[PDB]
Design a protein around this ligand. Structure first.
Ligand code: TPP
Ligand code: TPP
Ligand code: TPP
Ligand code: CA
Ligand code: CA
Ligand code: CA
Ligand code: CA
Ligand code: CA
Ligand code: CA
Ligand code: CA
Ligand code: CA
Ligand code: NA
Ligand code: NA
Ligand code: NA
Ligand code: NA
Ligand code: NA
Ligand code: NA
Lengths: 524, 524, 524
C-alpha cells in the first residue's frame, strides 16, 4: 500500500469522512484519487476553512479534518486557531510541504521551521522525518486532537511522501482506541459529594466543556438535586444549560470583583467545564469573598494550574457530571425561582433596537434553533432574550477573535441539518470571514445570517467611552452593502429597516430552501 | 507582604521545604532572609543540582524545588532535564533573571527569550510580566509539575521582583489542592475487567510510573489474580515489581521484533505505567504477532498518542492499578513458576566480572537497599542478579543521559535516610557529574558509589562491534584515579582489585558513617 | 559516494580537520571510518567538549566542529553555548539522532523537537528532512557559523543517514566561499572620518570582536592618530588592545552612570566591536552626559538595534578598523600619557593576596603568554596587573557562565602551541568543568591552571554585602583538594601557600612538559 492509501484508511477507520480545505500544489498528491466515501468542503480563504471545520467539530462532538496550503494557508488560519484553542475544538490541521529534496534550498512554497508556525495555538505540531512515518504521525494527530482536553493539532507533510510505500505494520494504527473518559477515584469523589451535600447555599457555574460533553442534562439533574442556582461562566463560548430552567441565572459578568460579589453568601461554588475564570474587563477586587469556597472540575491541566483560587479536579466533564448528578442527595431546600421575563424595550417604527431583534428571533425561530453570536455590543441582551432549551444551541468566538461565527454557522448547519442555524453578526464582524458565504451557497447549507448593521464597531466605541478615550481612530465602518456582498457570493439577500420588515424577512428566511442573509438596520 | 514572603509562604503551604541550588547574583534577592524552616542543598554544578533534586523527587514521590543562575546555570542543567522529562519527575526549576530595567539592553546575566531556553524538555516555561504576578506564576509551576503526567517546569524571575509588594489576594493560592487522581469510568472499566477475566493467557508489562505511584503492591495482587507473567518495560528507569516474585520475568529487550516474539501466544497484554515502547536498538519486525492484543494504561497523553499499536487509557496509575487489582477475578490457572537463579560466572583471583560484583552486592547489601545504575554495558546482568523486594529500589537515567546516577544517588539517599543507597556507575559515566561527590561529603549523605572501572566506554565498543564499525575514535578513557577524585571532594575512598578486596571494601563501606567510593577493577 | 564521504569531504574542503566530541551510539555511524587526516579530541562531559572547542575557535579565529550525543549531550553543553553566543564563537555543533524509522515512537535516544532544544542560544538550528540533504545542511551550518556576526549553530542528524547515497550534485558545495568582509560605503565613511577628525576630545571603546578580527594593531594606529584614550568595553570577553600602550585606560566599569561619567567631556566616543553596553550591576543614571555623542561599529544587528543611545554601523570589524586607521588625520594633540604602574599590595609570609599572584604572573610569564580569567572577585586587579602586549592574550566567559575557562584554556593551548596558556580560576569556578583536566593530560596539552583557593564564592559574598543581604545560603565551598582532583585526571599538581612557594611552583610549571595545576592559598 501507498502512504496515501494507508492514511485514508486510517482516517476512515477513525471515523473521519470529511475534509475541509482550500487546496494548493503541495496538497495535490494528497487530494488526488480522493476517496469516493469522503467529501471535500471547499472554502475560499483559510480562516473560513478552519471556522467551518470548527463549527462542525463543536456541534458534531467529534474531530474535524482540515487541509491547508503550506505556510501561507496555515498563516491565514491562525486567528481561527486562536478561537479553536480556547473552545477545546478537536481539529486535525494538515498542511502540505514542498518535496523533501527542495526543502533545504527553500524553494517557493517551502514551509520553513513548519512545526513552530502554529505554536502556541496547538496541542502538538509536527513534520515527519520520513514518508513511512506519515500514517503514524497522522495517528498521533487524530488521538491528540481527541484526547481531553481536546484541541487543534498540526501536521505538515512533504508532498512526495504520499506516493511512497507505507510500512505494512501501520495496520496496527487503524483500530486503536484511546480513552480519557475518567473520573475522580471513589474515595475522593465521596469526599466531594459529602461537601456538596453539606453545603448550606451551593451555587453552580458551568462552562463550554459541559456542552461539548453533552453533560447538560446531568448538570440539570445536579442543580435540581442541590437546589442550586446555575450561572454560565464568563465570556461563554457555548450554552451549557436550558436558559429558562428555574435554576438558571444567566451569564456571569467577566470581572473579578463582580464575580466575587455575585457569589457572596454561597458557601460552596462548584465550577464544571470552565476556566476559573475567563475574565475580560479589568475589575480588580477579591477573587472570592470570605465564606465562599470554590471547587473546579476541568478537563484541562492548563485551566486547573492557573486558577487564582479554589481546589481543582482534572477529569472528563461527561464522566464527572454524570457521577455527581447520580450520587448527590436530594436537598429539601426550595428549588430556585425562575428569572422573570425580560422587559420589552420601547420600539418605534424606525431602526431596530437589538433587544427587539432578539425578542423577535425568540418568537419566530424553532425551539431547536441554534444561535451563533458575533454581535459584540449586544451579548448580554442576547443571553437574556433567547430561550435555548437544548444542548448545542449557542456559539461565540471562544478567544474573542472575530471572523468565527459566519463560517462556524455553516459548519454547525452542516453538522445539524435538522436544526435551523441563525447567526447574529455585527456589521463589523461580518467582514472578517465574508467569503465563507460562498460555501453556504455552493453546498446549499441553509444557514440564516442576521447582520446587525449600525455602521460602527459598537463594542469598541463603548469601551472608548468607559476609558474616556478621545480621538480614537478607526471605529466606524460606514458604506457596506451586505445585500450586495450576499449577491456576490450567491446567497439570497433581504433587508429589514423596521420591525414589520424584520418579521417579513424572518418569515421568508425560515421557509427558504437555501442560505439567506438579512441585513437589519439597528440603532447606533 | 513582599513577593519574597508570599512566595515562601506559598511554597511552605504546598509542602516544599528544601531548595536544591547553585547560587548567583540574580538569585541573591530570592535567597536572602532564607527561611529558617527551609534547607538549602548546594551542589557545585547545575547538572549535579538537578540530578540530586531529581533523585530526591523520585524517591520522595513529591515535587522538588530547584534554584539556578540565569541562562548559563539553566543551560548547564539541560541534560539533566532530558532525563527528568522521561522519568516524569516533578521538578520546579526556577532561575533568576536580570532586573527588569536592564533586560532590554541585554546586560550581562540577562536570560534572553528565557521561556524558550528549556523547551522542549519542560511541561511549562514562563517569565512573569510583573512582580505581583510572581506568586501566581509559582502556583502555576507547583501544580503543573505535580499534575499527571508529572514533569519538570521552569520559571524565570527578574531579581528586582522579590522586594516588591505582593497582591494581598495571593493568599487564595496558599491552600489550593489540585487532583489528577482519576480512573476510567465504571462502564468502561467493567469492560476492561471482563477482557482481563476472559483472557486465556494474559501478560502484564509494567513501567516506571507504577513505582512512581507506589502501585507496586497492587500490581503484585493483579498479577497473582490473573496468574500472569510480569515484565518490566524496556529501558527501565525504575523497578515496578519484586524481582524474585514467581510472576517476574525481568527486563524486556528494547527491540520491536524481540518484544513481539516475547509476547507471542499472549492473547491480552496489559501495559501499565510505561510508554509503548521505549525501544532502543533497531530491531525491525512486527509490533505484535497475530493473536496478541495490547491495552495500555498511561498517565501521559504523549505516551498514549504515539503507541504504534493497542488501545490506551489515560488515567492515574495508582488509581487504576488499585481498581484493577481489586476488581478482577481470581483465575484458577496455575501461578507462574519463579525464574531460576542466575548462573555463577567463573571468577579467578584477578579483575572482577560484573556478574561477580552484582552477586556480591546482592549477598551483602541490606534487603531494603536502593540501587542506581549507570554502568551501561552491564544492565541486563544487574537486573538478573539483584533481588529487589521493595518499591523505590532502582533508578536508571530515563533518557539514557549520563551524569544522572551519581547526583541522583545523593538525592535518593537524602530522601530515604534509613535505606542504604548503592550507585553502580561505570568509569566513563562517573565523570559527567563527578563534582556531585562534594555534596555527599558536605551534608554527610552516606551514599555508596561503586565505580566499575574497565578503562573504556564499554557499551559503545560493543555497539561499534555490532555495526562492524572500524576506526571509531574516543572510546577509551584510560588514566582516571577515582580514589583521588573522591579525596578531592572529601569522600572516603577504597579500592577493589579482586573479589576478596571487593568483599572487604563493601564490608567497610556498609559500616561507614559517611559516603564511600569504591573503585572496582572490572574486566575489559 | 555516501553521505558520510561527501560530508567529510565538504568539511575538509572548508578547512575543518578536528572534531571535538563526546561519543554516543547515534554518532557511531558518523565517527566510523574516521578520516586519517582528521583528529578527534575527546572530553569527558559536554560542557567540557564545547568549552575546549570554543577556546580553540576563538584563538584560531576559525570555526570549530563539535559532535555531541542526542538531547542529553546537547543539553549538557547548553551553558557552554550561552557563553559562545555572547563571544560570537563560530561553533558548528552537531548531534546524532535516532534512526528515522524510530523517531515517531520516541525510542530511547530520540532527540524530540530537536531544532528547538538549543534555542535561543544558536544562530540556526535544524534537522534535515532526508539523508541526501545532510551535506547541504552541513554547508548551511558551516557558513552560518562563519558569517558575521559569527556564532554557534546546531545540526541534528539521524544516524541512518550517513550510509545512504549522497546526491552527486553536492559537489557544488565543496568550494563555496561566503564573504561578510564589508565596510561602510565611501560617502558615509567619509562623513564618519570627518566627524572623527573634527572631534576636540575623542575617546575610543573596544570590545571582543576587535580581538576576534585581529583588528588590534589597526585600533592602535587609530588611537595614535586621534590621540585618543582607549577603554575596553565592560564585562570584557577578550583583550583588544596592548594594556601598557600609552592610550590604554583599562576596563570600563559595567554600570550606566559610571560609564556616562567616565565619558563626560568626550565629544565623540567611537565604540568598535562591542555591544553598547554589556552593563552588569544596576547603576541607574544618564546613558551619556550632555555633550557626548556615541558612534558604534558592530558586526551584529542584535547589538546595533538594542543600544539605548548613539548611531550604529553594522559591518565587519576588521574591514572597518583598517579603513578608519588608514583614513583619519594625524591629530596634533598630545598623545595620552600612560597609566601609572599599579601599587604593590603589602604581602606577608602567609596566604596570597590576588594582587600578589597577578604581579608574580606578570613578572614570570613569557611576554606572549595567554591568560584566561574565571576568578570572579579579582577581575579588576587582573586587568590592571597583567601586561598583555599581543592579540589573543585574554579570555573571560562572555555570558558570565562559569565552567568556561578550564576547558577553554585547553582549546586555546591546542590552537597556540607556542604561547604558554595560564588559566587563573577560582576554587568555586574550577568545579563546573573539572573533568576537562583529563583532556589536557590525555593529549599532553601543556596548559597551566592556577586555582585561586579562598574557600568561598567570593564575588557572591561581596554582592550579598552590597545588598545588605543576610542569611544567604550556599556561599561557601570548603573541603576541596585540587591537587587530588588533578591527580585524579592525571595532571601534575603543585601547591603554593605563600609567595616563595608561588614563585617555586610557577618556575616548575613554566618548565614542565605537560599540563600543571597549582593550588594557591589566597586571602578570604
Ligand atoms: C480578529 C479581531 N480583530 C479585532 C477585534 C476587536 N473587536 C472587538 S469587538 C469589535 C467590534 C465589532 O463590531 P460589530 O461586529 O459591528 O459589533 P458591535 O460591537 O457594533 O455590536 C472589534 C473590531 C477582535 N476581537 N478580533
Ligand atoms: C550525556 C551523555 N553523553 C554520552 C552518552 C553516550 N554513552 C552511552 S553509554 C556510554 C559509555 C559509558 O561508559 P561507562 O560508564 O564506563 O560504562 P560501560 O559502558 O563501560 O559499562 C556513553 C559515552 C550518553 N548516553 N549520555
Ligand atoms: C554556571 C554558573 N553558575 C553560577 C554562577 C554564579 N557565580 C558568579 S561568581 C560565582 C563565584 C565563583 O567563585 P570563585 O570561582 O571561587 O571566584 P571568587 O568569586 O571567589 O573570586 C558564582 C557561583 C555563574 N556565573 N555561572
Ligand atoms: Ca508561531
Ligand atoms: Ca416573546
Ligand atoms: Ca456594529
Ligand atoms: Ca530550547
Ligand atoms: Ca548469592
Ligand atoms: Ca567503562
Ligand atoms: Ca613587576
Ligand atoms: Ca573563591
Ligand atoms: Na476508585
Ligand atoms: Na417605556
Ligand atoms: Na463512573
Ligand atoms: Na565454568
Ligand atoms: Na562605496
Ligand atoms: Na603599606
Amino acid at each position: 500500500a501507498s502512504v496515501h492509501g494507508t492514511t485514508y484508511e486510517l482516517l476512515r477507520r477513525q471515523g473521519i469522512d470529511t475534509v475541509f480545505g482550500n487546496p494548493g500544489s503541495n496538497e495535490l498528491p494528497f487530494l488526488k484519487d480522493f476517496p469516493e466515501d469522503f467529501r471535500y468542503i471547499l472554502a475560499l480563504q483559510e480562516a473560513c476553512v478552519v471556522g467551518i471545520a470548527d463549527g462542525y467539530a463543536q456541534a458534531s462532538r467529534k474531530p474535524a479534518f482540515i487541509n491547508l496550503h503550506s505556510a501561507a494557508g496555515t498563516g491565514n488560519a491562525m486567528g481561527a486557531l486562536s478561537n479553536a484553542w480556547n473552545s477545546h475544538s478537536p481539529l486535525i490541521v494538515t498542511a502540505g510541504q514542498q518535496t523533501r529534496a527542495m526543502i533545504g534550498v527553500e524553494a517557493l512554497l517551502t514551509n520553513v521551521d513548519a512545526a513552530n508556525l502554529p505554536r502556541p495555538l496547538v496541542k502538538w505540531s509536527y513534520e515527519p522525518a520520513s514518508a513511512a512515518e506519515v500514517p503514524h504521525a497522522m495517528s498521533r494527530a487524530i488521538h491528540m486532537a481527541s484526547m481531553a482536553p481536546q484541541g487543534p493539532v498540526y501536521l505538515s507533510v512533504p508532498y512526495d511522501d504520499w506516493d511512497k510505500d507505507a510500512d505494512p505494520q501501520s495496520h496496527h494504527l487503524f483500530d486503536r482506541h484511546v480513552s480519557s473518559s475518567v473520573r475522580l477515584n471513589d474515595q475522593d469523589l465521596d469526599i466531594l459529594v459529602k461537601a456538596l451535600n453539606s453545603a448550606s447555599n451551593p451555587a453552580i457555574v458551568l462552562g463550554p466543556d459541559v456542552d461539548a460533553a453533552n453533560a447538560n442534562a446531568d448538570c440539570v439533574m445536579l442543580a435540581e438535586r442541590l437546589k442550586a442556582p446555575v450561572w454560565v461562566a464568563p465570556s461563554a463560548p457555548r450554552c451549557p444549560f436550558p436558559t429558562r430552567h428555574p435554576c438558571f441565572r444567566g451569564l456571569m459578568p467577566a470581572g473579578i470583583a463582580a464575580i466575587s460579589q455575585l457569589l457572596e453568601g454561597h458557601d460552596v461554588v462548584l465550577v464544571i467545564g470552565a476556566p476559573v475564570f475567563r475574565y475580560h474587563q479589568y475589575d480588580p477586587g477579591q477573587y472570592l469573598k470570605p465564606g465562599t469556597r470554590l471547587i473546579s472540575v476541568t478537563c484541562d491541566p492548563l485551566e486547573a494550574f492557573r486558577a487564582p483560587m479554589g481546589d481543582a479536579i482534572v477529569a472528563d466533564i461527561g464522566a464527572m457530571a454524570s457521577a455527581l448528578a447520580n450520587l448527590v442527595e436530594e436537598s429539601s431546600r426550595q428549588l430556585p425561582t425562575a428569572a422573570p421575563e425580560p422587559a420589552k424595550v420601547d420600539q418605534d417604527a424606525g431602526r431596530l433596537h437589538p433587544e427587539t431583534v432578539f425578542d423577535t428571533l425568540n418568537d419566530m425561530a424553532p425551539e431547536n434553533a441554534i444561535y451563533l453570536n458575533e454581535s459584540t455590543s449586544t451579548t448580554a441582551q442576547m443571553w437574556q432574550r433567547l430561550n435555548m432549551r437544548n444542548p448545542g444551541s449557542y456559539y461565540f468566538c471562544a478567544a474573542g477573535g472575530l471572523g468565527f461565527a459566519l463560517p462556524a454557522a455553516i459548519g454547525v448547519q452542516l453538522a445539524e441539518p435538522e436544526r435551523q442555524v441563525i447567526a447574529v453578526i455585527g456589521d463589523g464582524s461580518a467582514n472578517y470571514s465574508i467569503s465563507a458565504l460562498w460555501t453556504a451557497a455552493q453546498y446549499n447549507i441553509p444557514t440564516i445570517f442576521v447582520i446587525m448593521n449600525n455602521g460602527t464597531y459598537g463594542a469598541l466605541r463603548w469601551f472608548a467611552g468607559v476609558l474616556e478615550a478621545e480621538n480614537v481612530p478607526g471605529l466606524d465602518v460606514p458604506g457596506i452593502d451586505f445585500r450586495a456582498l450576499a449577491k456576490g457570493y450567491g446567497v439570497q439577500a433581504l433587508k429589514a429597516d423596521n420591525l414589520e420588515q424584520l418579521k417579513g424577512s424572518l418569515q421568508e428566511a425560515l421557509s427558504a430552501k437555501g442560505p439567506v442573509l438579512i441585513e437589519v438596520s439597528t440603532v447606533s
